[PDB]
């Protein structure tokens, strides 16, 4: 009923950013974990626009070291043009991943209709390599590169990108949780001036501080619209194990929480991923269900769920 | 010695304020694991008054959906008036639980004698569901709704409980922990204007200024007894499982320890519950003992033992 | 290449300060996990000089209860000179121990090349008994006494020790980590108005005020060298189970990069212990892994390591 709960579903069952299958069954398990239902229980007025069919891209050999870049770069394109309808439908957009590669559509797509958009990146790496700078070659450790208006002539012309239009601007994006950046990515970081909160500056700061000033830098000068990029990554992987680039010391569940229960009140929120769970990488059933607990918790605080309680406005007492 | 440090223990083992078998055990497992040995260890005088006989109340059908009312309203009254003398021996009243529905009877019984006692409650949820708001009917989840003033004529004339008189008025209680409060009950917290620091809070300042403000709250015009009522599922699962509604995202162990430090350093502790350790709860043996092992590290800080360490007023270098 | 990058490795091969075997592994460990090629990695100028051949000394008895006395002495004795050379060399001496009575060598031959040195102090203890105040007998438990001018005629004349000279006054040292201190010792810490945040203090201050404090009191006067001695036990068990006194409710592995990403970037750290690994007390082959990860982690971090990342100084987008 209210802006801040009215949301257009997007499953984007996709894997070939990064190496590992698994993660295109993201949409499914937290479908399955009741998301959904669990959304429209605390008040969300819920559309579902499906799982986005991403048909297989058989001939895709590697750019350079660069890997399935067009079949990436298909499914980006196909979730640009859905986040876009969903937006102009009025509607918070819910991308379920799916790897981090998607990113690259989901911030185009809802930037075609809000370029005046702020970007919060929860995530234990900046995902900043270029083509070039990348050793992996892995395109869910390189969206936020072709996203940036800065880097433009930094990323050659790879099949399967000539529809992107870089978006957000260096000041446009705040990382949260970093704590493995690649020597590149770390250069781009300082030269670009980009503002980051680093487990250092969270462990320095309080998630309390990091959150004030996340949201006084992107929305002190005027209002606009919030996207929210979280790799469930950015946890402590004693909190969301089931993913395929873990790294230990991340935040806490309570601090993602946290840091989402404050997004959902500046009334801002207008994009959300939820990405990079991979079932298939839990060592154990309850690994598994830990992850997909964890994220459908996370994605409730987006959209209003508070750990202090909620109610409506009637008389309880009466 | 000191008045901080002398204590009258009572055993409280009763479970009829929720379904599960096995928090009546509490006082036993506590026991066994040396506290009132190691209470003496640390310079108390402790009294054992023993554990209450709380006789079976065979015929006790439900108040509405409400359960065992008349066995819950007959333990606590009892736990009011062993709680009294314990208070009138010039002792801290020290409730080993048992279930948290015996709130009733221990703040009550400590407020005969010192009526203008403050509560510290420590606990995933606000326990202060009405016999009318309440959907499980489970009376440890309703104890605070009992004792309020403000809420007198809220609470049906409820089998079992025509002799509680309301103690406390919703300026004398303060809220530590929650992460799992039912919508009526928000709607009381935020009727009443109740101070609450839920986990949200805590994220937000840090234990540090959570008790801060606790104390400064509950202290500031005028030093007074403080009660703490502590539900060991305010710690996180993890640290606490072996208890019967666990809530992830909880407090640390530290976070519990830097709690009752600060309550003992006040010197006005004045009456302590220990509340819902179910050793049948446990998983594993190992989280029997781990949860035991907390609720007596707990404990311990409540009457003196620090961190930092401590010792006796003599030279220890001659 | 950076004096701040410029190390000597020094193996301490040694358990006698303390009951338990295997601790004497510690070095071997540190090493298979890659240590120095680590090092290396991160621009670090590396030399290892070796592991120290501490002779037997199979005639060791008691001296009053205190254990091995003799053997602890010179085992120290050694140190302190193998950590003198690498100090005369222009390198930060790197001590891989070992049980933490080595503190009394390598803090020792440190000094007899920087008496000007401050102390930081990361440990669940203070390892400040005396021999006459111990109660265990155990030498792991008081090198700091020995070392502490003020306590120079409190410590007998113990067979083994007759080369110490106390090189620290009660002002040059800082504990971080503190929740299990003897009575004695907490005498000991009071009398001498010695800096320290226990446990209790982390939790108030946060890590960040901590080390803000920490860094301000030992460096505010005049910069001096700074030596680190971090017993792994300073960290919770859930991060470094194989280690011998493990206490409940310590630092955070995210606590531990801070304290350390902090002290190197004084650009002061001089000397450096990393104590009390003890891979046989593992109770898995993971608890094992996990203690020597987080160990090597926090060495790294000593060295520049940065959870932000790292670069040369080059243009990577060139
Ligand atoms: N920086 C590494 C890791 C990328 C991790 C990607 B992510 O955050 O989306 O899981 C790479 O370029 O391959
Ligand atoms: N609010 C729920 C849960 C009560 C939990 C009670 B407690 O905190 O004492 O374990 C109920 O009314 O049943
Ligand atoms: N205070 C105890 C414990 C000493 C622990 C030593 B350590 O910190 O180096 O492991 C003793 O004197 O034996
Ligand atoms: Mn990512
Ligand atoms: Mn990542
Ligand atoms: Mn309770
Ligand atoms: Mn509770
Ligand atoms: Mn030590
Ligand atoms: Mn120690
Ligand atoms: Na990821
Ligand atoms: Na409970
Ligand atoms: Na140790």
Chains 1, 2, 3 share one sequence.
Request: proline share 7%; charged share 25%.
């Amino acid at each position: 009923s209210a802006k801040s709960r009215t949301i257009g579903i997007i499953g984007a069952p996709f894997s070939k950013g990064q190496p590992r299958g698994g993660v295109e069954e993201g949409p499914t398990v937290l479908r399955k974990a009741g998301l959904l239902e669990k959304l429209k229980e605390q008040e969300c007025d819920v559309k579902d626009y499906g799982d986005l069919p991403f048909a297989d891209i058989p001939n895709d050999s590697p750019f350079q070291i660069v890997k399935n870049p067009r079949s990436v770069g298909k499914a980006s394109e196909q979730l640009a043009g859905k986040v876009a309808e969903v937006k102009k439908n009025g509607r918070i957009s819910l991308v379920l991943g799916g790897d981090h590669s998607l990113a690259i559509g989901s911030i185009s797509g809802h930037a075609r209709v809000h370029p005046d958009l702020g970007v919060i990146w929860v995530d234990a790496h900046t995902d900043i390599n270029t083509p070039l700078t990348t050793t992996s070659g892995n395109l869910h450790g390189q969206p936020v590169s072709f996203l940036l208006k800065e880097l433009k002539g930094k990323i050659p012309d790879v099949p399967g990108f000539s529809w992107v239009t870089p978006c957000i601007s260096a000041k446009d994006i705040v990382y949260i949780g970093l704590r493995d950046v690649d020597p590149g990515e770390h250069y781009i970081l300082k030269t670009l001036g980009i503002k980051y909160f680093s487990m250092t500056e969270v462990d320095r700061l309080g998630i309390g501080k990091v959150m004030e000033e996340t949201l006084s830098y992107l929305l002190g000068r005027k209002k606009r619209p919030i996207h929210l990029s979280f790799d469930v990554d950015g946890l402590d992987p004693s909190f969301t194990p089931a993913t395929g680039t873990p790294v230990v010391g991340g935040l806490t569940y309570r601090e993602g929480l946290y840091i989402t229960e404050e997004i959902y009140k500046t009334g801002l929120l207008s994009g959300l991923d939820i990405m990079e769970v991979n079932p298939s990488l839990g060592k154990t059933p309850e690994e598994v269900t830990r992850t997909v607990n964890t994220a459908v918790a996370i994605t409730l605080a987006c959209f209003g769920l508070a750990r202090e309680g909620n109610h409506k406005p009637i008389d309880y007492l009466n």
